[PDB]
PDB file of C-alpha atoms and ligand atoms in Angstrom:
ATOM      1  CA  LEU A  10     -83.119  48.440 -74.858  1.00 40.37           C
ATOM      2  CA  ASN A  11     -80.493  50.616 -76.123  1.00 42.31           C
ATOM      3  CA  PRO A  12     -78.933  53.552 -74.321  1.00 40.16           C
ATOM      4  CA  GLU A  13     -81.557  56.563 -74.180  1.00 39.56           C
ATOM      5  CA  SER A  14     -84.064  53.743 -73.435  1.00 38.02           C
ATOM      6  CA  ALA A  15     -81.896  53.056 -70.431  1.00 38.10           C
ATOM      7  CA  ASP A  16     -81.667  56.428 -69.298  1.00 34.95           C
ATOM      8  CA  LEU A  17     -85.407  56.447 -69.781  1.00 35.11           C
ATOM      9  CA  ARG A  18     -85.352  53.161 -67.400  1.00 31.51           C
ATOM     10  CA  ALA A  19     -83.124  54.967 -64.863  1.00 31.08           C
ATOM     11  CA  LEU A  20     -85.145  57.509 -64.516  1.00 30.81           C
ATOM     12  CA  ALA A  21     -88.693  55.671 -63.920  1.00 27.40           C
ATOM     13  CA  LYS A  22     -86.946  53.727 -61.632  1.00 29.46           C
ATOM     14  CA  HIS A  23     -85.777  56.643 -59.667  1.00 27.57           C
ATOM     15  CA  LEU A  24     -89.104  58.220 -59.276  1.00 26.05           C
ATOM     16  CA  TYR A  25     -90.759  54.826 -58.252  1.00 25.88           C
ATOM     17  CA  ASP A  26     -88.056  54.540 -55.584  1.00 27.40           C
ATOM     18  CA  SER A  27     -89.088  58.291 -54.296  1.00 27.13           C
ATOM     19  CA  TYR A  28     -92.597  57.372 -54.363  1.00 26.54           C
ATOM     20  CA  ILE A  29     -92.462  54.428 -52.130  1.00 25.96           C
ATOM     21  CA  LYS A  30     -90.685  56.463 -49.768  1.00 26.94           C
ATOM     22  CA  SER A  31     -92.636  59.442 -49.725  1.00 29.16           C
ATOM     23  CA  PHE A  32     -95.840  57.963 -49.799  1.00 24.51           C
ATOM     24  CA  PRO A  33     -97.232  55.718 -47.053  1.00 21.44           C
ATOM     25  CA  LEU A  34     -99.956  53.819 -48.317  1.00 19.57           C
ATOM     26  CA  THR A  35     -99.392  52.816 -52.133  1.00 17.49           C
ATOM     27  CA  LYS A  36    -102.005  51.545 -54.535  1.00 15.82           C
ATOM     28  CA  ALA A  37    -101.290  48.581 -53.989  1.00 17.26           C
ATOM     29  CA  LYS A  38    -101.241  48.580 -50.750  1.00 18.67           C
ATOM     30  CA  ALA A  39    -104.814  50.071 -50.905  1.00 19.30           C
ATOM     31  CA  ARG A  40    -106.247  47.826 -53.590  1.00 18.82           C
ATOM     32  CA  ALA A  41    -105.532  44.544 -51.286  1.00 18.86           C
ATOM     33  CA  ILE A  42    -107.312  45.888 -48.434  1.00 20.31           C
ATOM     34  CA  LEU A  43    -110.238  46.785 -50.512  1.00 17.80           C
ATOM     35  CA  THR A  44    -110.750  43.457 -52.763  1.00 18.81           C
ATOM     36  CA  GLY A  45    -109.381  41.849 -49.350  1.00 17.60           C
ATOM     37  CA  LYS A  46    -106.811  40.023 -50.756  1.00 18.53           C
ATOM     38  CA  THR A  47    -104.927  41.041 -47.369  1.00 17.96           C
ATOM     39  CA  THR A  48    -103.736  40.359 -44.069  1.00 18.23           C
ATOM     40  CA  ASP A  49    -104.602  42.684 -42.059  1.00 19.95           C
ATOM     41  CA  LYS A  50    -108.052  43.212 -40.660  1.00 17.61           C
ATOM     42  CA  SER A  51    -110.654  44.640 -43.004  1.00 17.62           C
ATOM     43  CA  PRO A  52    -111.229  48.216 -42.199  1.00 15.24           C
ATOM     44  CA  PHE A  53    -113.900  50.140 -40.170  1.00 13.77           C
ATOM     45  CA  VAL A  54    -117.036  51.356 -42.403  1.00 13.25           C
ATOM     46  CA  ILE A  55    -118.370  54.643 -42.116  1.00 17.02           C
ATOM     47  CA  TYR A  56    -122.002  54.272 -43.360  1.00 16.45           C
ATOM     48  CA  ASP A  57    -123.545  56.952 -41.164  1.00 11.82           C
ATOM     49  CA  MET A  58    -123.450  59.298 -38.237  1.00 13.83           C
ATOM     50  CA  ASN A  59    -122.909  57.079 -35.575  1.00 14.74           C
ATOM     51  CA  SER A  60    -120.886  54.610 -37.464  1.00 14.44           C
ATOM     52  CA  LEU A  61    -118.290  57.650 -37.965  1.00 14.66           C
ATOM     53  CA  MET A  62    -119.142  58.162 -34.195  1.00 17.07           C
ATOM     54  CA  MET A  63    -117.847  54.774 -33.376  1.00 17.40           C
ATOM     55  CA  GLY A  64    -115.392  54.624 -35.383  1.00 15.43           C
ATOM     56  CA  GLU A  65    -113.849  57.535 -33.980  1.00 10.34           C
ATOM     57  CA  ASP A  66    -113.069  55.295 -31.567  1.00 13.89           C
ATOM     58  CA  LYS A  67    -110.460  53.357 -33.669  1.00 13.83           C
ATOM     59  CA  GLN A  79    -113.782  69.547 -31.158  1.00 13.37           C
ATOM     60  CA  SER A  80    -117.750  68.198 -31.651  1.00  9.29           C
ATOM     61  CA  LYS A  81    -119.025  70.405 -34.797  1.00  9.03           C
ATOM     62  CA  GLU A  82    -121.518  68.823 -36.359  1.00  7.81           C
ATOM     63  CA  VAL A  83    -120.697  65.708 -38.939  1.00  5.67           C
ATOM     64  CA  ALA A  84    -120.328  67.372 -42.212  1.00  9.18           C
ATOM     65  CA  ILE A  85    -117.677  69.937 -40.879  1.00 10.55           C
ATOM     66  CA  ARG A  86    -116.093  67.306 -39.087  1.00 12.23           C
ATOM     67  CA  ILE A  87    -115.845  65.254 -42.632  1.00 12.22           C
ATOM     68  CA  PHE A  88    -114.769  68.462 -44.694  1.00 14.39           C
ATOM     69  CA  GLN A  89    -112.253  68.788 -42.284  1.00 13.79           C
ATOM     70  CA  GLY A  90    -110.773  65.516 -42.083  1.00 10.94           C
ATOM     71  CA  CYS A  91    -110.582  65.920 -45.960  1.00  9.94           C
ATOM     72  CA  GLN A  92    -108.528  69.385 -45.399  1.00 10.59           C
ATOM     73  CA  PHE A  93    -106.153  67.788 -42.684  1.00 10.93           C
ATOM     74  CA  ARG A  94    -105.137  64.893 -45.417  1.00 12.83           C
ATOM     75  CA  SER A  95    -104.418  67.419 -47.987  1.00 13.78           C
ATOM     76  CA  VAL A  96    -102.170  69.094 -45.889  1.00 13.91           C
ATOM     77  CA  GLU A  97    -100.238  65.977 -44.622  1.00 11.80           C
ATOM     78  CA  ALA A  98    -100.245  65.158 -48.800  1.00 13.59           C
ATOM     79  CA  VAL A  99     -99.086  68.453 -49.575  1.00 11.52           C
ATOM     80  CA  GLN A 100     -95.909  67.502 -47.137  1.00 15.05           C
ATOM     81  CA  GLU A 101     -95.687  64.151 -48.998  1.00 16.91           C
ATOM     82  CA  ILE A 102     -95.474  65.355 -52.854  1.00 15.55           C
ATOM     83  CA  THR A 103     -93.177  68.761 -52.056  1.00 15.77           C
ATOM     84  CA  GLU A 104     -90.851  65.894 -51.027  1.00 17.45           C
ATOM     85  CA  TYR A 105     -91.575  63.998 -53.912  1.00 20.91           C
ATOM     86  CA  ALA A 106     -91.074  66.746 -55.976  1.00 21.77           C
ATOM     87  CA  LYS A 107     -87.838  67.434 -54.708  1.00 26.31           C
ATOM     88  CA  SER A 108     -86.385  64.143 -55.617  1.00 27.54           C
ATOM     89  CA  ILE A 109     -87.265  64.946 -59.784  1.00 25.03           C
ATOM     90  CA  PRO A 110     -83.993  65.546 -61.560  1.00 26.41           C
ATOM     91  CA  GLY A 111     -83.831  68.791 -62.084  1.00 25.15           C
ATOM     92  CA  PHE A 112     -86.796  70.314 -59.896  1.00 23.56           C
ATOM     93  CA  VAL A 113     -84.434  71.732 -57.168  1.00 23.79           C
ATOM     94  CA  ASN A 114     -82.343  73.660 -59.471  1.00 23.26           C
ATOM     95  CA  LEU A 115     -85.388  75.662 -61.304  1.00 25.97           C
ATOM     96  CA  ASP A 116     -85.654  78.671 -59.646  1.00 24.42           C
ATOM     97  CA  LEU A 117     -87.413  78.823 -56.299  1.00 19.59           C
ATOM     98  CA  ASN A 118     -90.490  81.155 -57.044  1.00 16.44           C
ATOM     99  CA  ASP A 119     -91.250  78.685 -60.080  1.00 19.52           C
ATOM    100  CA  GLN A 120     -90.874  75.373 -58.023  1.00 19.03           C
ATOM    101  CA  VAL A 121     -93.418  77.410 -55.596  1.00 18.66           C
ATOM    102  CA  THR A 122     -95.567  78.052 -58.381  1.00 20.39           C
ATOM    103  CA  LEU A 123     -95.636  74.375 -59.704  1.00 17.28           C
ATOM    104  CA  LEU A 124     -96.154  72.751 -56.752  1.00 16.33           C
ATOM    105  CA  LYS A 125     -99.018  75.343 -55.654  1.00 12.09           C
ATOM    106  CA  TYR A 126    -100.860  74.393 -59.471  1.00 18.08           C
ATOM    107  CA  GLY A 127     -99.678  71.076 -59.361  1.00 17.99           C
ATOM    108  CA  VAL A 128    -100.574  69.796 -55.116  1.00 19.78           C
ATOM    109  CA  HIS A 129    -104.797  69.156 -56.217  1.00 19.17           C
ATOM    110  CA  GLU A 130    -104.025  67.210 -59.698  1.00 20.55           C
ATOM    111  CA  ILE A 131    -101.845  64.974 -57.228  1.00 18.78           C
ATOM    112  CA  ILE A 132    -104.043  64.442 -54.592  1.00 19.19           C
ATOM    113  CA  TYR A 133    -107.230  63.926 -56.854  1.00 19.81           C
ATOM    114  CA  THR A 134    -104.892  61.124 -58.718  1.00 20.65           C
ATOM    115  CA  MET A 135    -103.688  59.734 -55.918  1.00 21.76           C
ATOM    116  CA  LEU A 136    -107.093  59.664 -54.000  1.00 25.36           C
ATOM    117  CA  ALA A 137    -108.485  57.153 -57.258  1.00 26.14           C
ATOM    118  CA  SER A 138    -106.022  54.673 -55.663  1.00 27.50           C
ATOM    119  CA  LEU A 139    -108.244  54.713 -52.866  1.00 26.59           C
ATOM    120  CA  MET A 140    -111.159  54.586 -54.608  1.00 23.17           C
ATOM    121  CA  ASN A 141    -113.842  52.453 -55.569  1.00 23.26           C
ATOM    122  CA  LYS A 142    -117.174  52.805 -56.771  1.00 22.82           C
ATOM    123  CA  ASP A 143    -118.986  52.575 -53.395  1.00 22.73           C
ATOM    124  CA  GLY A 144    -116.285  53.989 -51.220  1.00 27.40           C
ATOM    125  CA  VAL A 145    -113.028  55.623 -50.096  1.00 26.18           C
ATOM    126  CA  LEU A 146    -110.301  54.308 -47.772  1.00 24.30           C
ATOM    127  CA  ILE A 147    -109.097  56.698 -45.292  1.00 25.40           C
ATOM    128  CA  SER A 148    -106.769  57.233 -42.267  1.00 24.24           C
ATOM    129  CA  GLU A 149    -104.119  54.710 -44.067  1.00 25.50           C
ATOM    130  CA  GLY A 150    -106.674  52.234 -44.770  1.00 23.52           C
ATOM    131  CA  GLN A 151    -107.719  51.650 -41.129  1.00 20.04           C
ATOM    132  CA  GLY A 152    -111.199  52.877 -42.310  1.00 22.73           C
ATOM    133  CA  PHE A 153    -113.699  52.824 -45.543  1.00 18.85           C
ATOM    134  CA  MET A 154    -115.902  55.927 -45.830  1.00 20.16           C
ATOM    135  CA  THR A 155    -119.225  55.090 -48.039  1.00 20.26           C
ATOM    136  CA  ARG A 156    -119.919  56.719 -51.148  1.00 20.29           C
ATOM    137  CA  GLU A 157    -123.640  56.830 -50.005  1.00 21.71           C
ATOM    138  CA  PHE A 158    -122.777  58.411 -46.831  1.00 17.12           C
ATOM    139  CA  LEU A 159    -120.644  61.348 -48.200  1.00 18.06           C
ATOM    140  CA  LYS A 160    -123.629  62.094 -50.972  1.00 17.87           C
ATOM    141  CA  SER A 161    -125.997  62.184 -47.974  1.00 18.43           C
ATOM    142  CA  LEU A 162    -124.113  65.110 -46.416  1.00 18.96           C
ATOM    143  CA  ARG A 163    -126.031  68.324 -46.287  1.00 21.30           C
ATOM    144  CA  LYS A 164    -125.259  70.748 -48.689  1.00 18.69           C
ATOM    145  CA  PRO A 165    -123.117  72.484 -49.879  1.00 18.32           C
ATOM    146  CA  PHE A 166    -120.995  69.239 -48.462  1.00 16.86           C
ATOM    147  CA  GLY A 167    -123.752  66.816 -50.502  1.00 15.59           C
ATOM    148  CA  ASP A 168    -121.928  66.673 -53.393  1.00 14.54           C
ATOM    149  CA  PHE A 169    -118.311  67.695 -52.884  1.00 14.67           C
ATOM    150  CA  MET A 170    -117.206  64.456 -53.389  1.00 15.79           C
ATOM    151  CA  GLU A 171    -118.723  63.131 -56.285  1.00 17.83           C
ATOM    152  CA  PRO A 172    -117.058  64.398 -58.894  1.00 19.58           C
ATOM    153  CA  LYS A 173    -113.773  62.918 -57.123  1.00 18.49           C
ATOM    154  CA  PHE A 174    -115.636  59.331 -57.508  1.00 18.95           C
ATOM    155  CA  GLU A 175    -116.824  59.642 -61.077  1.00 19.98           C
ATOM    156  CA  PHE A 176    -113.268  60.413 -61.922  1.00 22.00           C
ATOM    157  CA  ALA A 177    -111.595  58.128 -59.830  1.00 26.10           C
ATOM    158  CA  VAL A 178    -114.020  54.707 -61.624  1.00 24.11           C
ATOM    159  CA  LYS A 179    -112.632  56.611 -65.307  1.00 25.46           C
ATOM    160  CA  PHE A 180    -108.997  56.549 -64.117  1.00 27.31           C
ATOM    161  CA  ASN A 181    -108.718  53.304 -62.429  1.00 26.46           C
ATOM    162  CA  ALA A 182    -110.139  51.701 -65.237  1.00 27.27           C
ATOM    163  CA  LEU A 183    -106.628  52.312 -66.680  1.00 29.96           C
ATOM    164  CA  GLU A 184    -105.300  50.183 -64.307  1.00 30.14           C
ATOM    165  CA  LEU A 185    -101.995  51.883 -63.704  1.00 31.12           C
ATOM    166  CA  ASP A 186    -100.135  50.545 -60.824  1.00 34.53           C
ATOM    167  CA  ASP A 187     -97.420  52.288 -58.723  1.00 34.16           C
ATOM    168  CA  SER A 188     -94.335  52.133 -61.177  1.00 34.03           C
ATOM    169  CA  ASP A 189     -96.813  54.270 -63.904  1.00 33.91           C
ATOM    170  CA  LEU A 190     -97.809  56.460 -61.392  1.00 31.96           C
ATOM    171  CA  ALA A 191     -94.772  57.709 -60.086  1.00 34.29           C
ATOM    172  CA  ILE A 192     -94.048  58.666 -63.659  1.00 30.47           C
ATOM    173  CA  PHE A 193     -97.452  60.384 -64.227  1.00 30.84           C
ATOM    174  CA  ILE A 194     -97.224  62.516 -60.989  1.00 32.61           C
ATOM    175  CA  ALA A 195     -93.779  63.901 -61.806  1.00 32.91           C
ATOM    176  CA  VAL A 196     -95.416  64.914 -65.232  1.00 33.92           C
ATOM    177  CA  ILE A 197     -98.036  67.021 -63.599  1.00 29.79           C
ATOM    178  CA  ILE A 198     -96.047  68.500 -61.427  1.00 26.29           C
ATOM    179  CA  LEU A 199     -93.419  69.539 -64.307  1.00 24.61           C
ATOM    180  CA  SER A 200     -96.395  71.534 -66.508  1.00 23.84           C
ATOM    181  CA  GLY A 201     -94.524  74.428 -68.511  1.00 22.60           C
ATOM    182  CA  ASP A 202     -98.178  75.882 -68.525  1.00 22.47           C
ATOM    183  CA  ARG A 203     -98.951  76.877 -64.935  1.00 19.57           C
ATOM    184  CA  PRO A 204     -99.934  80.861 -64.837  1.00 17.73           C
ATOM    185  CA  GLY A 205     -97.211  83.165 -63.532  1.00 16.46           C
ATOM    186  CA  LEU A 206     -93.985  81.103 -64.516  1.00 17.62           C
ATOM    187  CA  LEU A 207     -90.380  82.810 -64.800  1.00 19.71           C
ATOM    188  CA  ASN A 208     -89.190  80.640 -66.931  1.00 19.79           C
ATOM    189  CA  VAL A 209     -90.645  77.946 -68.928  1.00 11.97           C
ATOM    190  CA  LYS A 210     -88.145  76.192 -70.644  1.00 13.38           C
ATOM    191  CA  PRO A 211     -85.928  74.659 -68.266  1.00 16.66           C
ATOM    192  CA  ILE A 212     -89.231  73.211 -66.997  1.00 15.13           C
ATOM    193  CA  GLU A 213     -90.760  72.071 -70.151  1.00 10.85           C
ATOM    194  CA  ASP A 214     -87.129  70.286 -70.927  1.00  8.74           C
ATOM    195  CA  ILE A 215     -87.475  68.164 -67.585  1.00  9.58           C
ATOM    196  CA  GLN A 216     -91.130  67.133 -68.625  1.00 12.95           C
ATOM    197  CA  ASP A 217     -90.171  66.092 -71.721  1.00 11.50           C
ATOM    198  CA  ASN A 218     -88.067  63.531 -70.357  1.00 10.10           C
ATOM    199  CA  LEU A 219     -90.768  62.507 -68.095  1.00 11.44           C
ATOM    200  CA  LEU A 220     -93.416  62.528 -70.585  1.00  9.07           C
ATOM    201  CA  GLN A 221     -90.896  59.655 -72.668  1.00  5.83           C
ATOM    202  CA  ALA A 222     -90.160  57.741 -69.539  1.00  5.05           C
ATOM    203  CA  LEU A 223     -93.713  57.490 -69.069  1.00  2.00           C
ATOM    204  CA  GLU A 224     -94.452  56.495 -72.549  1.00  2.17           C
ATOM    205  CA  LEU A 225     -91.641  53.935 -72.298  1.00  2.00           C
ATOM    206  CA  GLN A 226     -92.654  52.656 -69.249  1.00  2.00           C
ATOM    207  CA  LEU A 227     -96.768  52.276 -70.430  1.00  2.00           C
ATOM    208  CA  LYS A 228     -95.692  50.298 -73.291  1.00  2.00           C
ATOM    209  CA  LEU A 229     -92.937  48.340 -71.114  1.00  2.00           C
ATOM    210  CA  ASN A 230     -95.545  47.160 -68.372  1.00  2.00           C
ATOM    211  CA  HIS A 231     -98.412  47.316 -70.108  1.00  2.00           C
ATOM    212  CA  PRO A 232     -97.576  45.872 -73.492  1.00  2.00           C
ATOM    213  CA  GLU A 233    -101.366  44.867 -73.841  1.00  2.00           C
ATOM    214  CA  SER A 234    -103.042  48.159 -73.683  1.00  2.00           C
ATOM    215  CA  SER A 235    -102.507  49.950 -76.973  1.00  2.00           C
ATOM    216  CA  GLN A 236    -102.482  53.726 -76.622  1.00  2.00           C
ATOM    217  CA  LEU A 237    -102.651  54.145 -72.906  1.00  2.00           C
ATOM    218  CA  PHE A 238    -100.324  56.922 -73.226  1.00  2.00           C
ATOM    219  CA  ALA A 239    -102.970  58.918 -75.199  1.00  2.00           C
ATOM    220  CA  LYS A 240    -105.437  57.856 -72.636  1.00  2.00           C
ATOM    221  CA  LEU A 241    -103.924  59.179 -69.597  1.00  2.00           C
ATOM    222  CA  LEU A 242    -102.878  62.486 -70.880  1.00  2.00           C
ATOM    223  CA  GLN A 243    -106.225  63.231 -71.493  1.00  2.00           C
ATOM    224  CA  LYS A 244    -107.038  62.634 -67.907  1.00  2.00           C
ATOM    225  CA  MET A 245    -104.652  65.613 -67.102  1.00  2.00           C
ATOM    226  CA  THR A 246    -107.095  68.410 -68.418  1.00  2.00           C
ATOM    227  CA  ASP A 247    -109.770  66.090 -66.424  1.00  2.00           C
ATOM    228  CA  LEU A 248    -108.110  66.776 -63.095  1.00  2.00           C
ATOM    229  CA  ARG A 249    -108.102  70.983 -63.690  1.00  2.00           C
ATOM    230  CA  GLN A 250    -111.255  70.754 -63.722  1.00  2.00           C
ATOM    231  CA  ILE A 251    -112.137  68.654 -60.706  1.00  2.00           C
ATOM    232  CA  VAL A 252    -109.722  71.220 -59.352  1.00  2.71           C
ATOM    233  CA  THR A 253    -111.470  74.607 -60.679  1.00  2.63           C
ATOM    234  CA  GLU A 254    -114.928  73.559 -59.822  1.00  2.15           C
ATOM    235  CA  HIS A 255    -113.782  72.437 -56.722  1.00  3.83           C
ATOM    236  CA  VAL A 256    -112.759  75.905 -55.901  1.00  5.00           C
ATOM    237  CA  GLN A 257    -116.281  77.307 -56.576  1.00  4.40           C
ATOM    238  CA  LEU A 258    -117.322  74.949 -54.357  1.00  3.53           C
ATOM    239  CA  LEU A 259    -115.087  76.342 -51.909  1.00  4.69           C
ATOM    240  CA  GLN A 260    -115.679  80.338 -52.150  1.00  2.99           C
ATOM    241  CA  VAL A 261    -119.923  79.061 -51.523  1.00  4.72           C
ATOM    242  CA  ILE A 262    -118.788  77.225 -48.468  1.00  3.75           C
ATOM    243  CA  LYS A 263    -116.833  80.128 -47.328  1.00  4.59           C
ATOM    244  CA  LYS A 264    -119.824  82.390 -47.555  1.00  3.88           C
ATOM    245  CA  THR A 265    -122.150  80.069 -46.189  1.00  5.02           C
ATOM    246  CA  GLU A 266    -120.378  78.742 -43.493  1.00  7.50           C
ATOM    247  CA  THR A 267    -118.625  81.490 -41.440  1.00 12.89           C
ATOM    248  CA  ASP A 268    -117.953  78.319 -38.534  1.00 13.48           C
ATOM    249  CA  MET A 269    -115.538  76.968 -40.550  1.00 16.89           C
ATOM    250  CA  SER A 270    -111.615  78.305 -41.067  1.00 14.61           C
ATOM    251  CA  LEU A 271    -109.446  76.935 -43.654  1.00 14.30           C
ATOM    252  CA  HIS A 272    -106.005  75.150 -42.629  1.00 11.90           C
ATOM    253  CA  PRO A 273    -103.353  77.648 -43.417  1.00 14.68           C
ATOM    254  CA  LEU A 274    -101.307  75.787 -45.990  1.00 14.83           C
ATOM    255  CA  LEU A 275    -104.587  75.296 -47.958  1.00 18.03           C
ATOM    256  CA  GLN A 276    -105.095  78.973 -47.547  1.00 12.61           C
ATOM    257  CA  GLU A 277    -101.966  80.052 -49.495  1.00 13.24           C
ATOM    258  CA  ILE A 278    -102.159  77.064 -51.983  1.00 14.27           C
ATOM    259  CA  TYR A 279    -105.831  78.299 -53.079  1.00 12.60           C
ATOM    260  CA  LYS A 280    -105.150  82.313 -52.661  1.00 14.51           C
ATOM    261  CA  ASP A 281    -105.173  83.562 -56.315  1.00 13.57           C
ATOM    262  CA  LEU A 282    -105.223  79.851 -57.732  1.00  9.37           C
ATOM    263  CA  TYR A 283    -108.104  80.383 -60.285  1.00  9.31           C
TER     264      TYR A 283
ATOM    265  CA  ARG B   2     -96.586  84.882 -50.367  1.00 11.65           C
ATOM    266  CA  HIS B   3     -96.158  80.752 -50.140  1.00 12.98           C
ATOM    267  CA  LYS B   4     -94.460  81.133 -46.607  1.00  9.95           C
ATOM    268  CA  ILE B   5     -95.013  77.842 -45.551  1.00 10.15           C
ATOM    269  CA  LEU B   6     -94.287  76.404 -49.284  1.00 10.04           C
ATOM    270  CA  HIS B   7     -91.086  77.924 -49.130  1.00  8.85           C
ATOM    271  CA  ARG B   8     -90.334  76.476 -45.710  1.00  9.65           C
ATOM    272  CA  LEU B   9     -90.655  72.907 -47.101  1.00 10.58           C
ATOM    273  CA  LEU B  10     -89.085  73.405 -49.887  1.00  7.09           C
ATOM    274  CA  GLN B  11     -86.133  74.944 -48.090  1.00  8.42           C
ATOM    275  CA  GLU B  12     -85.966  72.844 -45.429  1.00  5.25           C
TER     276      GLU B  12
HETATM  277  C1  8LX C 301    -112.657  61.192 -36.622  1.00  5.02           C
HETATM  278  O1  8LX C 301    -113.752  60.606 -37.752  1.00  5.02           O
HETATM  279  C2  8LX C 301    -113.514  61.164 -38.983  1.00  5.02           C
HETATM  280  C3  8LX C 301    -113.805  62.557 -39.524  1.00  5.02           C
HETATM  281  C4  8LX C 301    -113.551  62.949 -40.572  1.00  5.02           C
HETATM  282  C5  8LX C 301    -113.934  61.783 -41.269  1.00  5.02           C
HETATM  283  O2  8LX C 301    -114.173  62.542 -42.636  1.00  5.02           O
HETATM  284  C6  8LX C 301    -112.798  62.285 -43.831  1.00  5.02           C
HETATM  285  C7  8LX C 301    -112.982  61.806 -45.024  1.00  5.02           C
HETATM  286  C8  8LX C 301    -111.659  61.362 -45.803  1.00  5.02           C
HETATM  287  N1  8LX C 301    -112.233  61.242 -47.227  1.00  5.02           N
HETATM  288  C9  8LX C 301    -113.628  61.452 -47.845  1.00  5.02           C
HETATM  289  C10 8LX C 301    -110.913  60.583 -48.418  1.00  5.02           C
HETATM  290  C11 8LX C 301    -110.107  62.338 -48.227  1.00  5.02           C
HETATM  291  O3  8LX C 301    -110.774  62.979 -49.416  1.00  5.02           O
HETATM  292  C12 8LX C 301    -110.371  64.189 -49.572  1.00  5.02           C
HETATM  293  C13 8LX C 301    -111.443  65.013 -50.072  1.00  5.02           C
HETATM  294  C14 8LX C 301    -110.835  66.261 -50.904  1.00  5.02           C
HETATM  295  C15 8LX C 301    -109.468  66.587 -50.392  1.00  5.02           C
HETATM  296  C16 8LX C 301    -108.878  67.617 -50.807  1.00  5.02           C
HETATM  297  C17 8LX C 301    -109.185  68.779 -49.226  1.00  5.02           C
HETATM  298  S1  8LX C 301    -110.881  69.277 -49.535  1.00  5.02           S
HETATM  299  C18 8LX C 301    -110.645  70.523 -49.546  1.00  5.02           C
HETATM  300  O4  8LX C 301    -111.680  71.743 -49.517  1.00  5.02           O
HETATM  301  N2  8LX C 301    -108.903  71.194 -50.200  1.00  5.02           N
HETATM  302  C19 8LX C 301    -108.896  70.247 -50.165  1.00  5.02           C
HETATM  303  O5  8LX C 301    -107.166  69.665 -50.498  1.00  5.02           O
HETATM  304  C20 8LX C 301    -108.517  65.726 -49.819  1.00  5.02           C
HETATM  305  C21 8LX C 301    -109.345  64.476 -49.411  1.00  5.02           C
HETATM  306  N3  8LX C 301    -110.988  61.245 -45.247  1.00  5.02           N
HETATM  307  C22 8LX C 301    -110.242  61.374 -44.076  1.00  5.02           C
HETATM  308  N4  8LX C 301    -111.763  61.804 -43.318  1.00  5.02           N
HETATM  309  C23 8LX C 301    -113.728  60.721 -41.445  1.00  5.02           C
HETATM  310  C24 8LX C 301    -113.703  60.175 -39.695  1.00  5.02           C
END
């Protein structure tokens, strides 16, 4: 380790410490729960309408709407965690405030789906800070148009989880996503790109130290960033459909804000 | 626009 490398390690450690502060349920905690290598009670499993209702002891809309709205509420909380984490990224708060807003607006769902993968396996997803586990088959079964809204996320997650990143890798990756110079409408790209270049150097060093076995993990990881955007644009289209067919539904105001003029 | 996001950022 030389001096520029050492600056890269300090950045990596700084981001990891903020990540743990900001995000209550880490991938490490999530993994223990899912394998059962944990000292906690195993989570309550929701595989049908009845288990969902019995689990609600651990409004009265139709179940598909309850579930979709539960997903919204989790994003609302995630946006808050991600915003706090973003503020800890060196140089982020010194950017033009409109640009900070634009980066968050475009970055949050990409981060949400990245981190949701930490909570997933091929059979289901942890919910409510790991107190629950909701089965993938149950989610597929919801009535249209809610029946397939999770499948692109599960599919992304099985591929992404094959990379076996840990929380220290993810902390940096998430920051790289937030500092994307190509977001529509940015006012001053150069200072964002300068920060992203350091973050990317830090990610690459991190991947080489923590995964010396896995050659070109860095390159594989960067290609996932393009897959994430597609998850998001497809999701926007499903929401357009949902808004048209269910006037029962109302979108949380934070989410309206984020989604407005997004793609 | 992005009133909540400003607020969360400026918080
Ligand atoms: C009271 O009993 C219950 C009621 C409901 C319930 O459903 C769930 C499901 C759930 N997941 C499936 C895990 C979280 O998946 C998510 C999926 C999509 C998003 C993106 C959201 S969606 C949108 O359009 N824009 C968004 O930003 C966020 C999270 N998480 C929490 N509750 C379980 C129990």
